[PDB]
Amino acid sequence: KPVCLVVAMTPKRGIGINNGLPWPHLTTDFKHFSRVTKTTPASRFNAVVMGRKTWESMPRKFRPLVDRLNIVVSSSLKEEDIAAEKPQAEGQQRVRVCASLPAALSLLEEEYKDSVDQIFVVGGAGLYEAALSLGVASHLYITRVAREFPCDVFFPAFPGDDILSNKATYRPIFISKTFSDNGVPYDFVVLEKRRSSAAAIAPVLAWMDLIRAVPHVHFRGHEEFQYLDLIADIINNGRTMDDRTGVGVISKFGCTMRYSLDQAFPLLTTKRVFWKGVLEELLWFIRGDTNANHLSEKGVKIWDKNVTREFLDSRNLPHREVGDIGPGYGFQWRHFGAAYKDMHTDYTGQGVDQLKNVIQMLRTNPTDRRMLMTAWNPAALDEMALPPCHLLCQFYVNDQKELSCIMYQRSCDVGLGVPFNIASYSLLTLMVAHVCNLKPKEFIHFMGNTHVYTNHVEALKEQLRREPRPFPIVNILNKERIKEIDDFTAEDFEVVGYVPHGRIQMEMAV
Amino acid sequence: PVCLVVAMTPKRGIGINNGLPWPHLTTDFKHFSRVTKTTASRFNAVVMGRKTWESMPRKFRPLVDRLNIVVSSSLKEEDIAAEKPQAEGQQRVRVCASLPAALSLLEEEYKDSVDQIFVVGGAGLYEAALSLGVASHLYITRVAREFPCDVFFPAFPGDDILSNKATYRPIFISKTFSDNGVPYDFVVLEKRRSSAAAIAPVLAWMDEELIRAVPHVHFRGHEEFQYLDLIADIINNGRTMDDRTGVGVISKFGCTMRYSLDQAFPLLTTKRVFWKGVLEELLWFIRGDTNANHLSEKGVKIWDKNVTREFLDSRNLPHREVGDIGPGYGFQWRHFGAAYKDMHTDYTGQGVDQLKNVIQMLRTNPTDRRMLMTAWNPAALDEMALPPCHLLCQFYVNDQKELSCIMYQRSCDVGLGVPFNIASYSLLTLMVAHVCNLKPKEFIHFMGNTHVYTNHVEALKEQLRREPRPFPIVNILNKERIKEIDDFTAEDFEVVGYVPHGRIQMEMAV
Ligand SMILES: NC(=O)C1=CN([C@@H]2O[C@H](COP(=O)(O)OP(=O)(O)OC[C@H]3O[C@@H](n4cnc5c(N)ncnc54)[C@H](OP(=O)(O)O)[C@@H]3O)[C@@H](O)[C@H]2O)C=CC1
Ligand SMILES: NC(=O)C1=CN([C@@H]2O[C@H](COP(=O)(O)OP(=O)(O)OC[C@H]3O[C@@H](n4cnc5c(N)ncnc54)[C@H](OP(=O)(O)O)[C@@H]3O)[C@@H](O)[C@H]2O)C=CC1
Ligand SMILES: C#CCN(Cc1ccc2[nH]c(N)nc(=O)c2c1)c1ccc(C(=O)N[C@@H](CCC(=O)O)C(=O)O)cc1
Ligand SMILES: C#CCN(Cc1ccc2[nH]c(N)nc(=O)c2c1)c1ccc(C(=O)N[C@@H](CCC(=O)O)C(=O)O)cc1
Ligand SMILES: Cc1ncc(-c2cccc(N3CCN(c4cnc(N)nc4N)CC3)c2)cn1
Ligand SMILES: Cc1ncc(-c2cccc(N3CCN(c4cnc(N)nc4N)CC3)c2)cn1
Ligand SMILES: O=c1ccn([C@H]2C[C@H](O)[C@@H](COP(=O)(O)O)O2)c(=O)[nH]1
Ligand SMILES: O=c1ccn([C@H]2C[C@H](O)[C@@H](COP(=O)(O)O)O2)c(=O)[nH]1
């Protein structure tokens, strides 16, 4: 009696154009559709109910949908029209035609009470709209396509449609990890209409034996749940400490996350991440550049507060020009151990080029276990505006030419920095994979002092009420031009299908 | 349906002079109470021998909320009537002439009143119960230290759970506890001879999918299961690769373990770990010593194969004397960045003493987030006999003056090195805690390239068939004398209650 809806949908609720699908073929989505509509426990089949145009949109070879009772809602098509279109295969059910959705559901009760198990409404907008109006839909199986495409047909507005993009309810109980086919990111959600072996162990367990992110979500496949759960874990279980800043901190020690890079890109969705910032900083690092004015001048001000006259003096660096971070990250990457003078100097050929070494080892001997890059130079710390937070990274290639990367971070501002750090090293992994002819597989985040500032806790709690959106894809453009790590520009990247929730203001502790 | 509850030394010792052999173990008593009390209006019964009844302090006898039965021919029910004032709600103590009689009485006069029957000592009752074959389960507290005893729990098939020599197999192994300088743990042996319905179909298509360590053990509380499961995980899921050595490897990337240091010490038990080796190497590191002959001369040969004329030449270090590891681990700890000459040189005051800095920061500003030590100096790598494996560690103090330590290891020989590395940095944590007036809490192991050599897999599979024993305690002796990190000697340590399985020979891949 209670129907399910099954649908794939752009963020703007688009489902169709020109009586076809808006996107190229999404293989995994089709598998899912088939598997959800066919699978059943009994001589009980499922029924699929569809509109006339949806029936017409389907290629002849696939229609009628096999092993499923097909019902078409139409006032023009007759059952004989359909029977005449293609010969009924033995064992399959003869396609029914009904005048409306109510009629289709009556027919299912009247003529098929003992025959059908589940009822699926499978489009188009006519049927989705009616089903929601009648209030007979218990569950929505929604494939969220993260890219927008030209569409002329749309899934109707519904309470809970904030799962799709920014503006009885339908709340998500299931959010998968991000898939991709043909350069299209997407994921799967399910919404629900809302409004004496063990007996011997038991007594010993008994004596031996709160903030949660979107707790209604039971299957937490989306990899962003690692970040969301880490926020909750620190707030619930962390310890309140003082620190350098004078601001409060709640901290934990020794934390881990890992993000797939093969299908999509972990640009967190639960608040907008400053992508221009990640890209510009990483290119700056790669250059060995220590002049934060080069960032500031492009609208990336992340380093400004730590390179003021004031902050440099608090660090006993009176001789530093404003903007000079000293021998920080990129300097140690490209010139480890070289004698620093200032940000204006040519250091070409001084010290160890760790990045070159890593790349050359990846290209020639990828089973080597010493493919590390470090920014932590105890001899140079006092000369830096700030000791590095992300201080070491290690590369690994498997049997399939898949590249993984670990980064160790001594100090993790979970609220502000962590999302930015995830994106930064995930991007570096993409860039290195490309230049070494490898496939990016995984970014692995190892975290030391993992903390949330006290002045962030109330904003972070709001963030935890948001369900994640599918991750976008990052494409490297102009691959043919790009042969070395130094070749990348700010323009050779495309972020595809990024649909985050709004910015949340969070003040940087200087 | 009877269960035995007992605490026992590795040699099966239970008693001396009609008392317990050990000082009071608080957690064991909690456990005993909780197991025997926890349950309708149905109580548990405890059955005990006369001497056991006499051994118990009057304040605790009879055992509250439990039907007490004493097995004796000399003692009388009436004696207990007037021995002590009887509370309402509690059951009158019964006396029976034998264990068979106690069990008959339970059937005859307490058919439905009682749930579980517990035999609670002493050797008279344990022996009878095992002879009758009426015991289904053993609740055994394994005391890891040996004590003078005159009374022993009987030999039983499966008593190899206690020390090295119808069956009793362990189904439960807890983590290691300690009270009054006594390590112990808890085992249980068993006598042998539509929210989810909507999610279901989507989960089914998403999973399109075997070594296990002592699989009969269902509750896997012992922290050594992290190591055992990591072995299994690599063998099951790892990828076969070549490597530097020419030997096969099966590898994974990005692995984690963490070990409590507050109660006991993670010296793995499933094979004997070379403790003299860990202690001597760590002291050597702390000295800044780079002469492996100093280790070799004490019977610690771990560095010999990597400091031969042959190996040094394969590394293009002809000018190195045999035994000179170059500017490796301890050199970088105590003298980061100093110009190396040879192992005979005084480097006092050259480079950065990272260990001193960490300790001074712990003693003066323990909320600082830069308490790191690194051995990874890209400028010096080519001069080293071997690039360091354990390359970075970070310290952390919470609000309770508890010290935790993270160590990052780029390359992990799971078979040979890992157990040794766990012990090494856990020990360093103890030493640092003491000298900084802190309480050791936790060692956290972060692992990069995590591998098992192919020529170890056969031996590792044997290792996985062994149940872990309780972890020992490591005590620092002569605490009063020891005020700085340099003060420790090879003699200021005591390892208490270590009862590992036998050595397993595993060749070092050179
Ligand atoms: N991305 C996705 O998940 C999905 C994509 N699609 C796309 O959607 C499009 C087709 O959907 P759409 O254009 O909305 O057409 P529909 O599938 O809704 O079919 C429209 C026709 O069906 C009949 N009908 C529908 N609703 C009613 C109603 N309430 N009462 C009576 N008759 C009704 C009428 O047939 P008649 O006029 O003969 O009486 C009507 O003209 C295509 O582009 C297709 O590719 C389809 C399914 C899902
Ligand atoms: N570590 C642990 O977990 C525990 C250890 N203990 C220790 O054990 C010691 C006492 O144990 P133990 O010396 O064996 O004494 P018991 O407590 O077993 O009592 C022995 C007496 O019980 C009676 N009895 C024993 N066996 C039988 C039998 N098969 N049939 C009939 N009557 C029997 C006899 O008294 P009678 O002649 O009157 O019948 C015998 O002298 C103490 O040191 C105590 O601290 C005790 C509890 C648990
Ligand atoms: C990490 C790192 C590099 N850094 C450097 C940097 C320097 C000092 C720091 N200090 C503290 N206390 N926390 C930090 O995260 C931090 C980060 C950054 C600094 C600022 C922003 C920032 O202003 N954030 C963006 C939004 C980014 C996001 O969504 O997370 C903004 O517009 O505010 C980002 C990165
Ligand atoms: C890590 C580390 C220290 N080290 C240093 C060290 C040096 C080179 C290495 N090389 C390789 N390939 N694997 C290693 O584990 C390794 C370890 C060790 C070296 C040897 C032994 C050894 O031959 N067996 C020990 C058993 C110790 C144990 O139980 O783990 C013995 O008793 O001889 C142990 C530790
Ligand atoms: C190239 C191509 N074009 C179309 C199809 C195809 C085959 C069978 C059915 C369909 N439909 C397209 C829309 N459908 C659908 C697809 N995906 C979800 N999640 N829900 C749906 N209702 C079911 C109907 C499309 C397969 N391959
Ligand atoms: C100082 C002190 N001395 C003795 C006791 C005490 C109190 C009640 C009972 C006992 N027993 C000691 C040994 N017992 C026991 C203890 N622990 C386990 N695991 N099994 C057991 N059977 C039960 C008998 C000991 C408590 N406190
Ligand atoms: O890439 C970065 C740079 C900085 N920080 C944060 C961590 C701390 O909150 C702060 C630096 O303070 P200390 O860890 O140096 O005390 O900046 C990050 O999280 N990531
Ligand atoms: O403390 C140590 C030192 C060495 N190794 C092992 C790891 C590797 O098997 C080998 C080092 O060889 P490379 O990682 O340099 O290839 O020694 C350890 O596990 N722990």
Curated annotation (Swiss-Prot), chain A:
Q: Does the keyword Metal-binding apply?
A: no
The positions flagged as active site in the entry are C389
Q: Extract the GO molecular function terms from the UniProt entry.
A: dihydrofolate reductase activity; thymidylate synthase activity
Oxidoreductase among keywords: yes
Annotated residues for binding of substrate: V6, D29, Y128, T143
BP GO annotations: dTMP biosynthetic process; methylation; one-carbon metabolic process; tetrahydrofolate biosynthetic process
Q: Which residues bind dUMP?
A: R244, H390, Q409, R410, S411, C412, D413, N421, H451, V452, Y453
Q: Which reaction does it catalyse?
A: (6S)-5,6,7,8-tetrahydrofolate + NADP(+) = 7,8-dihydrofolate + NADPH + H(+); dUMP + (6R)-5,10-methylene-5,6,7,8-tetrahydrofolate = 7,8-dihydrofolate + dTMP
Where, by residue number, does NADP(+) bind? 8, 14-20, 52-54, 73-76, 123-130
Q: Part of which pathway?
A: Cofactor biosynthesis; tetrahydrofolate biosynthesis; 5,6,7,8-tetrahydrofolate from 7,8-dihydrofolate: step 1/1
User: What SUPFAM superfamilies is this protein classified in?
Assistant: Dihydrofolate reductase-like, Thymidylate synthase/dCMP hydroxymethylase
Please give an example of a GO cellular component term from this record.
cytosol
**Where is the stretch described as Thymidylate synthase?**
222-510
Keywords, A to Z, come to: Methyltransferase, Multifunctional enzyme, NADP, Nucleotide biosynthesis, One-carbon metabolism, Oxidoreductase, Transferase
Which EC number(s) does UniProt give? 1.5.1.3, 2.1.1.45
Q: Report the domain of life of the source organism.
A: Eukaryota
The DHFR domain covers: 2-193
- What does this gene product do? Bifunctional enzyme. Involved in de novo dTMP biosynthesis. Key enzyme in folate metabolism. Catalyzes an essential reaction for de novo glycine and purine synthesis, DNA precursor synthesis, and for the conversion of dUMP to dTMP.
User: What is the similarity comment for this entry?
Assistant: In the N-terminal section; belongs to the dihydrofolate reductase family. In the C-terminal section; belongs to the thymidylate synthase family.
Protein's name in the database: Bifunctional dihydrofolate reductase-thymidylate synthase
Query: Which taxonomic lineage is given here?
Result: Eukaryota, Sar, Alveolata, Apicomplexa, Conoidasida
